[PDB]
């Protein structure tokens, strides 16, 4: 009995049910004997009686067993076998082996070409922004879903809606965030393991797997089964939205879950196997192209930083007073990385530009970095957790990155970021409200957004590994300025 | 016009006026309405009665085939295997438009597997390669075993455009070229341009009777065969191949950062051509090989850069506990040899030398330090040609032909110096010095023995160039050492 108290640990990989848009047979490892079957196998495949204890050869016939045993060699990911002949009827068959069990999934029948056409419309994108923008538009028109979104996962596991294409009558979620808890760890693991997650009907009656628990007390692990049933938590969430069906394409960068291409329909919908194969091929190209553009943007940003710091080094060689040059120059360092403010703290004198803590606050911050830092870059996105008094000015500066200008003096170049809620660009309608089921308003985008805001209260956008690399290049450039100055003075 | 060794550097190999005899070529107007030119062998190969120039493409090829070819041109040349011609027979057709001309190329169809299946099997056998070395090593063995050529080599182009043979799979009776180099002049610029433009270059027969394109000149214009796979071969290269005993070849161009990284060169000692479907597979393999090489290269660069940073960070922590930085460096300098490929390293501080490995003699260092001082703007200075900067350095070029200097001060001419031997000293050539080659009318220039001798002369007194990676690591070392000096001054 899953509810909001235990849905974080719901065993969604072993639900004991499938979705009604196909049927499922579980065989032993050698595909000799039928061990389990979905209750709808008789109806869909035209079979009579309890299929359990019948041979694979009996239930499937000599030909299909021969063909499926061969395909099981290909087994990586599940083998997708569209348009397989049974009675001379056509079934789209998915076949995999996991936990010493052969799972065979059947759909009544109805790729390179569709895939090639989609990939040709994104392969010329030359920015991450351009790729993610055009992808929702392209997937929506090609796969025919009412809404297509892209989420980018944040360092804390929250999702941000970074792209959206939708029917003009729908509310917008663009620029919205949801908390990490909206997608539990087992769901994330399954998104990482499977390219596609299909939900044909959020109000479809689940079909039991017979048996749910076998004679040995083992549940059936449906981790790689596309027909695997959906948490009633998530089904209630979609029903509250008015969503009736979904398909997600997992975006994998550096072997990790970067985000999802989330396709939502406001009526039941399932794509044929051939179209899903195309969507999966599109997903792999999207992921690779995203990873290529992301590397290029990083390289350009690091190179920009180096060229700016080299200009500063050449400039500084012609200056007898380094403190004066920095007082005149420090605001230009704001261009090195995303920040809302920058400041110079040298000889107990403060110079601020943009959104910073007030001069009164800087001694305490300088003191804390001196204590906290081992002479290297020190950075936090949650100043109030380090310095409670920092809560007062969290609206202006919730995040700080500190570059030491000396190992002897408590002098710093300080970068600041606003509370992340202050930089929101949400396209949504705060008047749009949602109906709820027995679990209450927790399972609504409105409440999800409110919960996210509570989790980032008094916090800024985290300092990226790139921001930290740029900060280290700046620390080291400034050491060099100081050294060359002492060499000649 | 006759090509020879004085003008082969500018031979117009894109407009030879001939094709190779393993197919035939029809050139049409941009709309594929009219036949403008044809190879002499079109008559024999396609079974066409009478001169073709002036006829409609539909009259020559039939309405159905021209319809399909028009469609293919609507949807790199188009590779169309097993096309049915008007007389029932199957032809592998290559189709492209260039310089307002449609070029149709024909080969008799055989029996072939789907290219994608062939390509996938090859790709599956290199995709698990986790180093550049493992990829380059296994690729010549795999390609030879798949395509059935007598020799498969990989060349890597050097900074000066020279090729190095970095992988080889061969018949056991053949001479080895592994670890050999050839000078840049062995592949002229227009040949390089065509290796960049075309993934595959096919030579069916290095001694084969050229088939004329009729007419060779139309308006005075020759037929541009830049993208035609049947384009004939320079007499110079055919003579080179005949001298080697090579009768046929196929090269797969390796493209990295939109530049020609190298070739997978397939050589046969008897006339040989692959079917179009196996050539499509070879092209798909080449594309995958290029991408996987780039991924392995990126990981190897990142690992060497991170290894350098980790080592320089250990040194910074170490130095913080040392009152005497000069002494620490005297004790430590040899460890810096581990940052980048080098044959020697030394410390020049306070007119005192300490050397490790292959370095100039102690007496040579003051002249080198003085040179860097006058030539450097207080940043890293590096050369692979010391004697070109300092004539005196020729004396010790065997030991040290290349130097990368890291300045330790802006007010004292103190350096950490890295050295590389003359490149011929680090040669790992698997070849037979007693293997000799017959020659044609152009003489022994067109032989591997003389190619290698010419290369050796182009790099005499020179080392392996310092890579962009080596220079990035040197700059991290310079900066780390500035930081050691500064923190020393802060606390002392
Ligand atoms: C305690 C467990 C909860 C839970 C579980 C599951 N969520 C799953 C998928 C899922 N949930 C959401 C959340 C959203 N928040 C929004 O603000 C919003 C829209 C504006 C959505 C849709 C998302 C985004 C997803 C990802 C799929 C998609 O986008 O379509 C999930 C997996 C379902 C499956 O098996 O396919 C589980 C389990 N959701 C909760 O809210 C909680 C409390
Ligand atoms: C002045 C022009 C010259 C010239 C022209 C061409 N060379 C072409 C191809 C070619 N040439 C070589 C050279 C080699 N040097 C070796 O030492 C060696 C073997 C040990 C070889 C084979 C190479 C490597 C190649 C690349 C193709 C291959 O390796 O199979 C060329 C293009 C031919 C074409 O149309 O396909 C031209 C033109 N070669 C000279 O030596 C000079 C003087
Ligand atoms: Cl749209
Ligand atoms: Cl990103």
Numbering used by the authors:
A (entry chain A): 7 to 81, 85 to 95, 97 to 120, 125 to 503
B (entry chain B): 6 to 80, 86 to 228, 230 to 503
Sentences from the paper on this structure:
In this work, we employed an approach to disentangle noncovalent and hydrogen-bonding electric field changes during the reaction cascade of a multidomain protein, i.e., the phytochrome Agp2. Agp2 originates from Agrobacterium fabrum and carries a biliverdin (BV) chromophore. Phytochromes harbor a methine-bridged tetrapyrrole chromophore as a light-sensing unit, which upon light absorption undergoes a photoisomerization at the terminal methine bridge followed by a cascade of structural relaxations.18−21 This reaction sequence interconverts the parent states Pr and Pfr and involves proton translocation, which has been shown to be a prerequisite for the functional secondary structure transition of the tongue, a phytochrome-specific peptide segment. In the present work, we have generated two further variants with ortho-cyanophenylalanine (oCNF) at positions 165 or 192.
We determined the crystal structures of the Pfr state of Y165oCNF and F192oCNF variants with 1.90 and 2.06 Å resolution, respectively. Structural details of the ZZEssa chromophore geometry and rotamer positions of amino acids within the CBP display a very high similarity between the oCNF variants and the WT protein, whereby F192oCNF is virtually indistinguishable from the WT. The region between 1500 and 1700 cm–1 is dominated by the C=C stretching modes of the methine bridges between pyrrole rings, which are particularly sensitive toward geometrical changes of the tetrapyrrole skeleton.54 In the Pfr state, a nearly perfect agreement between the WT and F192oCNF spectra in this region underpins the preservation of the chromophore structure in both proteins. In the Pr-minus-Pfr difference spectrum of F192oCNF, the lack of a positive band in this region confirms the shift of the tautomeric equilibrium toward the enol form. Phe192 is located in a hydrophobic part of the CBP. Accordingly, no strong H-bonds are expected for either pCNF or oCNF at position 192, which is confirmed by the crystal structure (F192oCNF) and the structural model (F192pCNF) for the Pfr state with the exception of a H-bond in the oCNF192 backbone to Gly173. For the sake of simplicity, we may therefore classify the H-bonds of the protein-bound phenyl substituents on the basis of the EF,tot,HB values as very weak (0–15 MV/cm), weak (15–30 MV/cm), medium (30–45 MV/cm), strong (45–60 MV/cm), and very strong (>60 MV/cm). Both F192pCNF and F192oCNF reveal only very weak H-bonding interactions because this residue is located in an essentially nonpolar pocket as shown by Pfr structures. A strong field increase upon Pr formation is also found for F192pCNF and F192oCNF, which is, however, accompanied by minima in Lumi-F and Meta-F, respectively. In both Agp2 variants carrying the nitrile group at the ortho position, the noncovalent electric fields remain largely constant during the photoconversion.
